[PDB]
């Protein structure tokens, strides 16, 4: 106590209080910018998407290993993960429901193998002791495809080489900008879609060299696509998470500079009173 | 009238106040330490032309007479709540707050905007000061709070780039 | 005692104190100089009082009245300091004067939501009356959040709910505005006395959608809404 | 005249209505004219010509990519950086070794870093809730 | 007489164990209640949830307090309450819910009102 | 203040620290002691230079004791050994 | 008295100079702390290794310090002050490593400390 001291601490709560109010106004810039960086990854996967539906599963069909479904020995998992704390319950949510189904699976004997997006999941599955063969860390705010190429290109090379019969990527799922659901999705083998080309008899493609040639490498960037894709909402996820994070903060401080003051209004009356009794009451 | 420390005059009073033993009030000041000023910087009047005439007996006439008044306190370590700095703050018309981390940065004078602030206002402004600077207060004090705010906010937008950049010059 | 002589006649007196900390202090002056001993924050000890043989003259007898509006200094922005803590047990009413309601333009700048008193109870002023200051209460103290949402997620994130709270609270915020015969001065509009069945018509009427179908600067400055829906008719 | 779009898998390239383009396919290179039959193949690392209608022509870089063509659009999947097996398989490699050895690489967003140490530092040793009586 | 020489080095342990993690949790509590407990690193998420536990299970019915709470009065022997703690400290306990602890006596009677809820 | 004004030195025990475990419970940076090395056998006054100076890089890095998972690893060794000494 | 008027544009100059270089450090030391060294720019590497070789040459063995450390003591004349903190400023010293300044004396005597370790 002594009403210095803590004018001395709310000068500081009010300090907090102003990083706070700026570092939501920092996420909340960042949200709309990662969501405008968002919706512009939408076209190639449609267009992509429709492109194999027809080739693949339209008025033909080729045997190739991503579409039909093997048994399960192993599962491969891609988890995608932030960079900087203060994004609030996001990550460990997510952590907890991965944890949740990869011990469903290995009940049933079969292991589990992960790949990691950010150094948050690098960190948390390190202590834990989950199993990672391959990560990439350091995105920041600026994820890109040429960075990705390696994880993924790791598990679908683990996956027709036969040492994997599943693959996830687990991720948060940005919906509104007050909630951002963690959601596991399967992208191999290939989820099947509706719209079959039924309306695309009217044509076929001249393909070149060969078809079976093209689909191999098509489903390849599509599942790269997808991919990239869960980086970037989990990345707009991040911000919508921090900005609320630091909303909530800001209303702690300032909740709490309310109890400061009444506690140094107290010391100060207390201060007065005692220094002024000393004085008359001394003398004489 | 320029007074140089009314804190160093509130001071000497006490003083000579307890060697008379007279009972003391907050902070060991004699009970009317606010006496002290108040009879004093209110003497710092402006008197119309009818006082004038009957005090110096018809010799002026047209004439009404004025004394500024500019007293000078200091605060420790930027503390305007004090005893005796915020008795001041009561009787004076507005006040002028110089800010050390202003001046420290060679911002000099370092006038404080937002907290300093003149309570007569523009009627005793020249008319030509009253239409170019109507503005400049509010103005920096926004882009100080705005510039505090870009600490952290690297990429702004080209709005408040160019709110910050212009305050900026004329700060 | 003035203003008693003038209850005695009869009449009902308004009483104005230019500032009762300043009466206060001049007590505690006076005692220090009878070299009475200080109490509890180095106030006189007779400090409760005095405040209270002059409170306690401003009152209704069956003659007359005083009313009493005081201006009140809180020192060191403490609510709790022997000074206002004595003060406060007197008040019966608090109006609030916000610096940013009047950059905002509306006059008089009174605070609708630090402003208090104490007869705002359903036994005393009737549950119209009550219910109705209390709507427009909530009604402004949503919209304190909503604006600070729109602050930084923009307009376009509120519901479609939250906008037309939005848009009536502008208008109950503008109808508190009013034209004084005093200010006609300033602004030429002559000024409007609006008894209170008027206002406590208006409020009921905006908080329930009923002139929703009219702009918010019809509101704004007008007087009564009988005056108000006149306005708009010619924007 | 036809709809071309070229998209890479991060944003947009193009779009906007084209007479012809001439694109240097796999196979060979090939040139495409309003209602050309659909076709689909990959192409190799290197410019792409188009002629937006009123003629006028440009030139655009591409890392690879697949043309799809239909009747009345033509849609160019670009991707953002060389693709191939020795490549990708370096990607690959690192990736391992970067899992393999614990080697954690920071991120570059110097403003969280600011306002983290800021805060930090703010919030130590401020031992408030000894002294605002909050009970928690 | 909190002595290793005096007490046994067990009790004074267990003692000591227990001071150290609720001061570990009064640092806690200033970034707890300005941050909210999500920042807490994911070690000492667990101290808080023990700390929580341990400032439960120092609760205990007295006889002399049925009167105010109906609930009947426990007589809690030393033995047995160094060997709660120890199973608290230890993590061996460390899946019940904070509540199980509440006004209970040994560590075998919240293990059972685990049981309720 | 008028003790700490008179002795050569001081040591500062603390309650927080003692409650922490750390007994005996001096406050390094804190506590003083003015005749300093001259008062010591030269093997201590010849290690015990590396100790403050540990302890010093330590306590200005304390405040990120917090946020640890976040330090890069040359602070974080500097952070453990500061652990470690104390 | 530290004022362009008194002391000289020069001396002013190199002082207002070391404090700025050490102001820019006190801004960059928790930047490095959380993002480590290898993110700043290779100016800014600069303003680090600059402010920490000040940082030492600010240090100086006293006569009477020779007591305490065994050292013997140095003076500095303002010349020789002013011209090695303005050299170090001004990069003429990029090649020398840190603890060539540290206790060192005059600058002249840095260089001659650095062919030594």
Same mark, same amino acid.
């Given at each position: 106590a002594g009403a210095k001291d803590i004018r001395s601490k709310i000068a500081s709560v009010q300090n907090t209080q102003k990083i706070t109010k700026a570092m939501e106004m920092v996420a909340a810039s960042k949200m709309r910018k990662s969501q405008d960086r968002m919706a512009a990854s939408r076209p190639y996967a449609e267009t992509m998407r429709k492109v194999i539906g027809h080739l693949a599963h339209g008025n033909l069909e080729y045997k190739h290993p991503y579409l039909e479904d093997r048994d399960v020995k192993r599962v491969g998992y891609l988890v995608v993960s932030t960079d900087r704390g203060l994004a609030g319950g996001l990550n460990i949510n997510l952590f907890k429901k991965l944890l949740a189904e990869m011990k469903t699976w290995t009940d049933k004997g079969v292991q589990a193998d992960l790949a990691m997006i950010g150094s948050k999941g690098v960190s948390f599955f390190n202590s834990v002791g989950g199993n990672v063969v391959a990560q990439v860390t350091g995105m920041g705010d600026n994820p890109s495809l040429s960075e990705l190429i390696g994880p993924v290109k790791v598990m679908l090379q683990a996956y027709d080489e036969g040492r994997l019969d599943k693959l996830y990527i687990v991720s948060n799922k940005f919906i509104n900008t007050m909630s951002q659901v963690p959601t596991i999705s399967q992208l191999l083998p290939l989820p099947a879609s509706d719209d !079959? !080309? %039924? +309306?695309? +008899? @009217?044509w076929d493609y001249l393909y070149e060299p060969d078809p079976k040639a093209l689909l191999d490498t098509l489903l390849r960037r599509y599942v790269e696509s997808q991919v990239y894709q869960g980086v970037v909402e989990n990345l707009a996820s991040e911000q919508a998470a921090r900005m609320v994070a630091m909303k909530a903060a800001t209303d702690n401080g300032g909740s709490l500079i309310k109890e400061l003051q009444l506690v140094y209004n107290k010391a100060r009356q207390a201060s007065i009173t005692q220094e002024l009794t000393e004085i008359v009451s001394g003398a004489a | 009238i320029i007074y140089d420390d009314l804190s160093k005059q509130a001071v000497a009073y006490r003083q000579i106040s307890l060697l008379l033993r007279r009972p003391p009030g907050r902070e060991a000041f004699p009970g009317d330490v606010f006496y002290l000023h108040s009879r004093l910087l209110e003497r710092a009047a402006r008197v119309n032309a009818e006082y004038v005439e009957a005090f110096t007996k018809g010799e002026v006439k047209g004439k009404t007479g004025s004394l500024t008044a500019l007293p000078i306190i200091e605060t420790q370590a930027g503390d305007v709540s004090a005893f005796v700095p915020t008795n001041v703050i009561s009787i004076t018309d507005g006040q002028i707050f110089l800010e050390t981390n202003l001046f420290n940065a060679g911002i000099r004078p370092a006038v404080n905007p937002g907290i300093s602030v003149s309570r007569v206002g523009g009627a005793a402004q020249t008319k030509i000061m009253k239409k170019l600077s109507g503005g400049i207060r509010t103005a920096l004090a926004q882009y100080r709070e705005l510039a505090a705010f870009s600490q952290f906010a690297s990429d702004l937008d080209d709005a408040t780039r160019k709110q910050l950049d212009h305050g900026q010059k004329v700060t | 005692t003035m203003a008693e002589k003038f209850r005695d006649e009869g009449r009902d007196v308004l009483l104005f104190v230019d500032n009762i900390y300043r009466y206060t202090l001049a007590g505690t002056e006076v005692s220090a100089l009878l070299g009475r001993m200080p109490s509890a924050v180095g106030y006189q000890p007779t400090l409760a009082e005095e405040m209270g043989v002059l409170q306690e003259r401003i009152t209704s007898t069956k003659t007359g009245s005083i009313t009493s509006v005081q201006a009140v200094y809180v020192p060191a922005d403490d609510l709790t300091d022997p000074s206002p803590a004595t003060t406060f047990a007197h008040l019966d009413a608090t109006v609030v004067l916000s610096r940013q309601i009047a950059s905002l333009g509306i006059y008089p700048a009174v605070d609708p939501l630090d402003s208090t008193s104490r007869q705002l109870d359903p036994l005393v002023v009737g549950q119209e009356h009550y219910d109705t200051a209390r709507g427009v209460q909530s009604i402004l103290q949503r919209y304190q959040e909503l604006k600070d949402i729109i602050a930084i %997620?923009?307009? !376009?994130? %509120? @519901?479609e709910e939250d906008k037309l709270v939005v848009a009536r609270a502008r208008k109950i915020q503008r109808f508190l505005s009013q034209p004084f015969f005093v200010a006609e001065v300033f602004t030429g509009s002559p000024g409007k006395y609006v008894s209170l069945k008027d206002t406590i018509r208006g409020f009921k009427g905006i908080m329930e959608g009923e002139y929703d179908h009219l702009p918010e600067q019809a509101f704004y400055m007008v007087g009564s809404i009988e005056e108000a829906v006149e306005k708009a008719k010619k924007l | 005249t036809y709809h071309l779009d070229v998209v890479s898998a991060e944003q947009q390239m193009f779009s906007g209505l084209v007479e012809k383009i001439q694109v240097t396919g796999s196979e060979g290179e090939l040139g495409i004219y309003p209602g050309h039959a659909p076709l689909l193949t990959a192409i190799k690392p290197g410019m792409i010509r188009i002629v937006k209608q009123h003629g006028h022509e440009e030139f655009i870089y591409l890392s690879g990519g697949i043309l799809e063509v239909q009747p009345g659009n033509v849609t160019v999947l670009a991707d953002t950086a060389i693709r191939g097996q020795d490549l990708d398989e370096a990607r690959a490699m690192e990736a391992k070794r970067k899992a393999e050895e614990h080697i954690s690489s920071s991120h570059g967003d110097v403003d969280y870093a600011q306002a983290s140490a800021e805060l930090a530092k703010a919030i130590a040793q401020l031992r408030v809730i000894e002294l605002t009586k909050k009970a928690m």
């Open positions: !079959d !080309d %039924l +309306k695309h +008899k @009217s | - | %997620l923009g307009m !376009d994130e %509120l @519901s | -």
